[PDB]
Design a protein around this ligand. Structure first.
Ligand SMILES: Nc1ccc(C(=O)O)cc1
Lengths: 257, 245
């Protein structure tokens, strides 16, 4: 199994890490270089917060400048945006992967991905808006519903020409602890859909709730634990903040499992 | 479910239990109450390669495990109240088997090719390390019990007279040691195996690899972990046990 990165293929015979490089206010090259040094396989840059919600119409000056710089490192770069407007400029500069939190609901995003021959991440979110997503954190059967959505969006994207689709359950996005636990426990069912699967629980509320850690910045141990469980379920792509911690844990885990 | 006998009470193994390490080798019992606050279920004290501190720590009401090769030390520790005897020699000396059965305390049987640590690495030549470790643990356990020891805990002795290849083989088939029916204890905190697999040269900076190895052991059925960073493990287990169960 491999992941297409616009002009190169990354083998998923071992877990690959997407180092998060937030380009927002509260919660580049120097840190990007550090993550690469720590073992990041892909650098995931985002300029608009999807936290459970400030809309930013011209985030081009936020991202593109850092992006161009980061792309000079020679490492694959994932662009996290829900605006076709932003993606196009990102893809034209060299982006290798498009990470869309709105789950490719926008045809413009699908069209662009297909046009540039770039894979796209389809993430589940009950509704296209992060400001009200938590307001819709209710499902008849969350696993069944998230699975159906991911598969349907992936199908829609592929038949449109998108080379490949990566599925992401979207932990924490319009989901309460119970929903995240359910998805984690049955994550193998999403892996069984045949597409590469990506997950990211780094420092999320669910980790805080289960580990009893008040400060999001001190949740690395619960985050590593959740991610190892996901790896055990077949996931080979992880979105993380602490790259070194994960590389160290995986060094042990992959030699044992 | 299964339990661990601790001199005057039983500890439920329905969930993973942590033995927090307190080494007193080359005073303030702060670290003691600190580890208990972090989530340690048992306090492991050892001053080998004690008594004054042991008496102080015991007043916390938390079970205390003592690590020693010398029976003279074990006796005085048991007489003071120690709840678990951890013999780092395979429980080869019938003198400490006698102390355990006499004080009615459980004893840990840890595997090592030979008693002396100065030459045990010269005895890391197993034809089948898993089979041989299993045979040894079972034999020592069968002997200790017949002698009156209330309960025995088995420890594969990672890093004791074992090459990386041996440690890996034991970890990968750990379920086979759990299948012997006794509570199993593992301690990979800061060990060379972790340094080798995680690429971390400084022993004090191996927490992430240690947590990963211990979660793997938990997945294999181990419910007792000897650890240095108590908090890091409690945090990881909070997530792991909620998910994997
Ligand atoms: N973007 C996000 C950041 C954090 C969380 C979360 O903690 O659940 C969810 C989404």
């Amino acid at each position: 199994r491999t992941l297409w990165l616009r002009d190169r293929a990354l083998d998923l015979d071992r877990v690959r890490l997407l180092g998060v490089l937030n380009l927002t206010p509260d919660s580049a090259l120097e840190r990007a270089r550090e993550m690469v040094a720590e073992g990041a396989d892909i650098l995931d840059l985002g300029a608009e917060s999807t936290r459970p919600p400030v809309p930013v119409e011209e985030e081009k000056r936020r991202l593109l400048p850092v992006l161009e710089a980061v792309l000079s490192l020679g490492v694959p770069v994932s662009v996290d945006t829900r605006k076709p407007e932003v993606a196009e400029e990102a893809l034209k500069l060299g982006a290798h992967l498009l990470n869309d939190v709105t789950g490719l609901r926008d045809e413009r995003m699908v069209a662009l991905a297909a046009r540039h021959g770039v894979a796209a991440v389809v993430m589940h979110m009950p509704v296209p808006d992060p400001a009200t997503m938590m307001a819709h954190a209710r499902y008849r059967d969350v696993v069944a519903e998230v699975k159906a959505f991911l598969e349907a969006q992936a199908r829609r994207a592929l038949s449109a020409g998108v080379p490949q689709v990566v599925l992401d359950p979207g932990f924490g996005f319009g989901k309460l602890l119970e929903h995240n636990l359910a998805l984690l426990r049955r994550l193998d069912e999403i892996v069984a859909l045949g597409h590469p699967v990506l997950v990211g629980l780094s420092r999320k509320r669910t980790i805080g709730e289960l580990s009893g850690v008040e400060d999001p910045a001190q949740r690395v141990h619960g985050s590593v634990a959740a991610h190892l469980f996901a790896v055990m379920k077949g996931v080979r792509l992880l979105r993380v903040h602490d790259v070194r911690a994960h590389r160290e844990a995986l060094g042990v885990w992959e030699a044992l499992y």
